[PDB]
Design an enzyme around this catalytic site. Sequence first.
Site, PDB file in Angstrom:
ATOM      1  N   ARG B 127       0.845  -1.179   0.000  1.00 38.24           N
ATOM      2  CA  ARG B 127       0.000   0.000   0.000  1.00 38.24           C
ATOM      3  C   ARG B 127       0.891   1.243   0.000  1.00 38.24           C
ATOM      4  O   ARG B 127       1.129   1.843   1.048  1.00 38.24           O
ATOM      5  CB  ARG B 127      -0.884   0.011   1.248  1.00 38.24           C
ATOM      6  CG  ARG B 127      -2.351   0.331   1.004  1.00 38.24           C
ATOM      7  CD  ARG B 127      -3.173  -0.948   0.912  1.00 38.24           C
ATOM      8  NE  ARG B 127      -4.577  -0.720   1.249  1.00 38.24           N
ATOM      9  CZ  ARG B 127      -5.418  -1.676   1.641  1.00 38.24           C
ATOM     10  NH1 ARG B 127      -4.998  -2.934   1.745  1.00 38.24           N
ATOM     11  NH2 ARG B 127      -6.677  -1.374   1.942  1.00 38.24           N
ATOM     12  N   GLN B 132       0.346   2.535  -6.734  1.00 45.64           N
ATOM     13  CA  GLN B 132      -1.008   2.789  -7.211  1.00 45.64           C
ATOM     14  C   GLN B 132      -1.293   2.310  -8.634  1.00 45.64           C
ATOM     15  O   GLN B 132      -2.407   1.867  -8.920  1.00 45.64           O
ATOM     16  CB  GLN B 132      -1.323   4.278  -7.079  1.00 45.64           C
ATOM     17  CG  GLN B 132      -1.610   4.694  -5.650  1.00 45.64           C
ATOM     18  CD  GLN B 132      -1.411   6.180  -5.403  1.00 45.64           C
ATOM     19  OE1 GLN B 132      -1.849   7.025  -6.191  1.00 45.64           O
ATOM     20  NE2 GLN B 132      -0.753   6.509  -4.295  1.00 45.64           N
ATOM     21  N   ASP B 135      -1.671  -1.671  -8.560  1.00 42.34           N
ATOM     22  CA  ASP B 135      -2.587  -2.205  -7.560  1.00 42.34           C
ATOM     23  C   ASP B 135      -3.933  -2.652  -8.145  1.00 42.34           C
ATOM     24  O   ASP B 135      -4.795  -1.823  -8.448  1.00 42.34           O
ATOM     25  CB  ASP B 135      -2.808  -1.137  -6.488  1.00 42.34           C
ATOM     26  CG  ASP B 135      -3.504  -1.680  -5.257  1.00 42.34           C
ATOM     27  OD1 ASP B 135      -2.923  -2.557  -4.582  1.00 42.34           O
ATOM     28  OD2 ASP B 135      -4.628  -1.228  -4.961  1.00 42.34           O
ATOM     29  N   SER B 138      -7.358  -1.656  -6.167  1.00 41.65           N
ATOM     30  CA  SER B 138      -7.824  -0.293  -6.448  1.00 41.65           C
ATOM     31  C   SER B 138      -8.512  -0.117  -7.790  1.00 41.65           C
ATOM     32  O   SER B 138      -9.544   0.554  -7.886  1.00 41.65           O
ATOM     33  CB  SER B 138      -6.651   0.704  -6.393  1.00 41.65           C
ATOM     34  OG  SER B 138      -6.393   1.131  -5.069  1.00 41.65           O
ATOM     35  N   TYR B 229      -5.309   1.275   6.004  1.00 47.23           N
ATOM     36  CA  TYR B 229      -6.519   0.553   6.099  1.00 47.23           C
ATOM     37  C   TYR B 229      -7.096   0.657   7.527  1.00 47.23           C
ATOM     38  O   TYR B 229      -6.643   1.491   8.321  1.00 47.23           O
ATOM     39  CB  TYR B 229      -6.411  -0.949   5.731  1.00 47.23           C
ATOM     40  CG  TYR B 229      -5.164  -1.667   6.220  1.00 47.23           C
ATOM     41  CD1 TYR B 229      -4.121  -1.859   5.300  1.00 47.23           C
ATOM     42  CD2 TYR B 229      -4.951  -2.007   7.533  1.00 47.23           C
ATOM     43  CE1 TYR B 229      -2.927  -2.428   5.676  1.00 47.23           C
ATOM     44  CE2 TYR B 229      -3.745  -2.584   7.921  1.00 47.23           C
ATOM     45  CZ  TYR B 229      -2.750  -2.794   6.997  1.00 47.23           C
ATOM     46  OH  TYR B 229      -1.560  -3.378   7.373  1.00 47.23           O
TER      47      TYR B 229
HETATM   48  N1  LIG Z   1      -1.139   2.120  -3.842  1.00 49.19           N
HETATM   49  C1  LIG Z   1      -1.723   2.773  -2.749  1.00 49.19           C
HETATM   50  O1  LIG Z   1      -1.197   3.723  -2.129  1.00 49.19           O
HETATM   51  C2  LIG Z   1      -3.177   2.251  -2.260  1.00 49.19           C
HETATM   52  C3  LIG Z   1      -3.732   3.164  -1.394  1.00 49.19           C
HETATM   53  N2  LIG Z   1      -5.011   2.799  -0.913  1.00 49.19           N
HETATM   54  C4  LIG Z   1      -5.724   3.733   0.037  1.00 49.19           C
HETATM   55  O2  LIG Z   1      -6.253   2.992   1.099  1.00 49.19           O
HETATM   56  C5  LIG Z   1      -7.498   3.666   1.661  1.00 49.19           C
HETATM   57  C6  LIG Z   1      -8.607   2.664   1.617  1.00 49.19           C
HETATM   58  O3  LIG Z   1      -8.198   1.385   1.072  1.00 49.19           O
HETATM   59  P1  LIG Z   1      -9.155   0.411   0.230  1.00 49.19           P
HETATM   60  O4  LIG Z   1      -8.293  -0.210  -0.802  1.00 49.19           O
HETATM   61  O5  LIG Z   1     -10.390   1.007  -0.156  1.00 49.19           O
HETATM   62  O6  LIG Z   1      -9.440  -0.779   1.300  1.00 49.19           O
HETATM   63  P2  LIG Z   1     -10.688  -1.426   1.988  1.00 49.19           P
HETATM   64  O7  LIG Z   1     -11.516  -2.181   0.991  1.00 49.19           O
HETATM   65  O8  LIG Z   1     -10.147  -2.159   3.235  1.00 49.19           O
HETATM   66  O9  LIG Z   1     -11.517  -0.163   2.397  1.00 49.19           O
HETATM   67  C7  LIG Z   1     -12.813  -0.291   3.097  1.00 49.19           C
HETATM   68  C8  LIG Z   1     -13.183   1.003   3.657  1.00 49.19           C
HETATM   69  O10 LIG Z   1     -14.181   0.824   4.733  1.00 49.19           O
HETATM   70  C9  LIG Z   1     -13.738   1.497   5.828  1.00 49.19           C
HETATM   71  N3  LIG Z   1     -14.160   0.770   6.979  1.00 49.19           N
HETATM   72  C10 LIG Z   1     -13.667  -0.372   7.581  1.00 49.19           C
HETATM   73  N4  LIG Z   1     -14.317  -0.754   8.656  1.00 49.19           N
HETATM   74  C11 LIG Z   1     -15.324   0.167   8.825  1.00 49.19           C
HETATM   75  C12 LIG Z   1     -16.414   0.292   9.879  1.00 49.19           C
HETATM   76  N5  LIG Z   1     -16.598  -0.515  10.884  1.00 49.19           N
HETATM   77  N6  LIG Z   1     -17.272   1.423   9.676  1.00 49.19           N
HETATM   78  C13 LIG Z   1     -17.185   2.314   8.694  1.00 49.19           C
HETATM   79  N7  LIG Z   1     -16.167   2.224   7.688  1.00 49.19           N
HETATM   80  C14 LIG Z   1     -15.244   1.114   7.798  1.00 49.19           C
HETATM   81  C15 LIG Z   1     -12.192   1.703   5.780  1.00 49.19           C
HETATM   82  O11 LIG Z   1     -11.667   2.676   6.581  1.00 49.19           O
HETATM   83  C16 LIG Z   1     -12.029   1.873   4.317  1.00 49.19           C
HETATM   84  O12 LIG Z   1     -12.116   3.274   3.894  1.00 49.19           O
HETATM   85  C17 LIG Z   1      -7.575   4.941   0.721  1.00 49.19           C
HETATM   86  O13 LIG Z   1      -6.912   5.903   1.434  1.00 49.19           O
HETATM   87  C18 LIG Z   1      -6.854   4.518  -0.571  1.00 49.19           C
HETATM   88  O14 LIG Z   1      -6.458   5.584  -1.359  1.00 49.19           O
HETATM   89  C19 LIG Z   1      -5.706   1.642  -1.237  1.00 49.19           C
HETATM   90  C20 LIG Z   1      -5.084   0.757  -2.120  1.00 49.19           C
HETATM   91  C21 LIG Z   1      -3.762   1.017  -2.691  1.00 49.19           C
END
Ligand SMILES: NC(=O)C1=CN([C@@H]2O[C@H](COP(=O)(O)OP(=O)(O)OC[C@H]3O[C@@H](n4cnc5c(N)ncnc54)[C@H](O)[C@@H]3O)[C@@H](O)[C@H]2O)C=CC1
Lengths: 357, 372
Positions: B127, B132, B135, B138, B229
């Site tokens: 991550r 990006q 990935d 994403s 995450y």
């Molecule tokens: N290459 C990179 O830098 C990558 C960066 N990211 C970043 O990671 C973050 C999110 O990652 P995703 O891939 O979407 O992963 P994910 O599928 O784990 O995201 C699920 C979302 O649900 C939220 N969530 C989890 N439990 C919850 C609860 N009980 N109640 C309410 N919300 C809850 C999390 O905070 C998250 O925003 C972003 O900031 C994204 O830009 C993600 C993938 C690659």
Amino acid sequence: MKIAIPKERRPGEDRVAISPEVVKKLVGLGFEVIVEQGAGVGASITDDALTAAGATIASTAAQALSQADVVWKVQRPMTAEEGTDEVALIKEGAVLMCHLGALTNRPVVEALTKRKITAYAMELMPRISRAQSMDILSSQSNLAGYRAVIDGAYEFARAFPMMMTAAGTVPPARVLVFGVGVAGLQAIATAKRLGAVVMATDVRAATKEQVESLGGKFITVRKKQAEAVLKELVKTDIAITTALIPGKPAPVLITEEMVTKMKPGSVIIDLAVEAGGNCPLSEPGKIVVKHGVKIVGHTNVPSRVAADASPLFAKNLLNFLTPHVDKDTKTLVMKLEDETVSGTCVTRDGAIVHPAL
Amino acid sequence: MKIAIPKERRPGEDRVAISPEVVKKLVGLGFEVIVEQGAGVGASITDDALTAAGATIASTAAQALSQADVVWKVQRPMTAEEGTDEVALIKEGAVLMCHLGALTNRPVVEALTKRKITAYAMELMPRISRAQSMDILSSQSNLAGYRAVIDGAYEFARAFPMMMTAAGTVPPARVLVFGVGVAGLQAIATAKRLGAVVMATDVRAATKEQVESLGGKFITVDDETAGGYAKEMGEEFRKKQAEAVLKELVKTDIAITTALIPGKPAPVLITEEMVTKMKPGSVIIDLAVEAGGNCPLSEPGKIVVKHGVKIVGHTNVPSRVAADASPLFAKNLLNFLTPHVDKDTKTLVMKLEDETVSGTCVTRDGAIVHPA
Ligand SMILES: NC(=O)C1=CN([C@@H]2O[C@H](COP(=O)(O)OP(=O)(O)OC[C@H]3O[C@@H](n4cnc5c(N)ncnc54)[C@H](O)[C@@H]3O)[C@@H](O)[C@H]2O)C=CC1
């Protein structure tokens, strides 16, 4: 005075000619509103929502219509000829307002006449500025246009919007609309906000100003225009056809030939499938997969938006009826001289008032 | 050097780890690309389109992976136990790149090891910002969030945008996005495209700015998450979140749940009790259905109607947008592999110092690396 709304019995019809907001206004005019139980469920209108607005729920349509002075329905009533005789349930001399097919159905009219029922064919509403608020064709076609796009995007394996991402960019969907009528206009507006590139066409060039109004590109090439449409179509993702001229088969805008040249994964939504279809390959109520192309031909499109189609249909009826309510004497007095009344009335006092067949 | 892409065989998978644009890049990198016949049909990619790009078409998947030095797949290959032994088709010593579901599919991992195949589980991609573009999670989730809105609009019997007609005004749909990760963000943007009023909530404060920047309102619950995450949140919060979310859920027409927690089962965000207070005709699109679901009423691969509410639990949502998901997936692989194709000398040498390599590689030359 009693006004009844039964549940639409014709298979596939999920709209209902009533809404809680209208029930409140009807009661406000002095009516007792009776609705068949389950009538609005298809439109997300519960019996409790309706009783909360002032309506009484009746079981079975016979009960609802037994003593109703006014009856509202979405589709024309069924005859003994089609099985359940719905006309025999309407009180003799009562007032019926609904889409009566009017133009094409003789038996329903004969049936209505025999019972001395005065029926107003809402779909025959005069095309005058002041009656736009009573026009059902418009209200339902507007939602039908919006839904054409929704169904188009659901069946498409690509995203409508152009997406520029870390992993590259997603090109926008290319939408081509045939028929800039009320529905065509909403299909264009909807396909636009979703981010697609929208092209529109129509034999009526007076629409050219509106297609460009919503962001669409009128296709200008006069039959060498056919080559100008095959040009756009060959690189079209979603082709939406809305060439439905109420009272006449639909024009064949896309031959199986034009489809064999389209690209795999493409989608054609034929809103005119009922009247033959703008595309001869479409089959009423099904999605055909030919030449790698999906031909969508859902039947009751406004019913696919029943929860919004119903409240609007109900207000078209209320708008048409409100000017004629006494309320102080709690009786309906349709002004015969009113243009919306004389133009939609197809049968009254046992006499067929309109020539169509 | 031969790189091959076979047809995805797992149930319902319509994507394909290739695209004509990428076949072009690969060939230029010095590769001989082979795609199994009809591998891109579900993705709207014809063999002709791949041939024009410079790819060879192989009648069978066996024929395509026969001499292949590198193999690109969307989902993990099937084992002999699952019927078609795809691992056996992979040349021993070859490199495999795909979403391996490694962490929860050890058999396919050790099966790959027995053939001394080197496998990089793309879903483990570090991550980090410089990743990006490689990935897959994403790129795939972004399209799934868009799709959640299309499937949502499809099941909804009302229009999304506010409609101003001669028959009157029909208010716009109220959308609530649970979990504003990559999927939730696109859901908001797409919901806003259709003109809906969008609300959203997440446990990560960083998401509040992103939500408002898209025209949505953030539903703050407490305030007072992790190394990218989310974590498994407490009950005081969990019960206060429900209470604060319900204030809006009773007006909501479409609820899209995308909440995931690395490792653990998906958090339950909408209980049956909450569903019972929603408007009849409302739709819940549960994108975390495969990880357990954010709604206990969701059932994988089905649309359930409970208390007048539609609970949609489609599986492999990225495949529902397979024609756009595949070219992006292929690009994630391309971007992941490119930095390693030596130019001074030309072959494929994955530099192990690379964080994207140490992190995705789960097996290399007969040895498993980091199963614990
Ligand atoms: N290459 C990179 O830098 C990558 C960066 N990211 C970043 O990671 C973050 C999110 O990652 P995703 O891939 O979407 O992963 P994910 O599928 O784990 O995201 C699920 C979302 O649900 C939220 N969530 C989890 N439990 C919850 C609860 N009980 N109640 C309410 N919300 C809850 C999390 O905070 C998250 O925003 C972003 O900031 C994204 O830009 C993600 C993938 C690659």
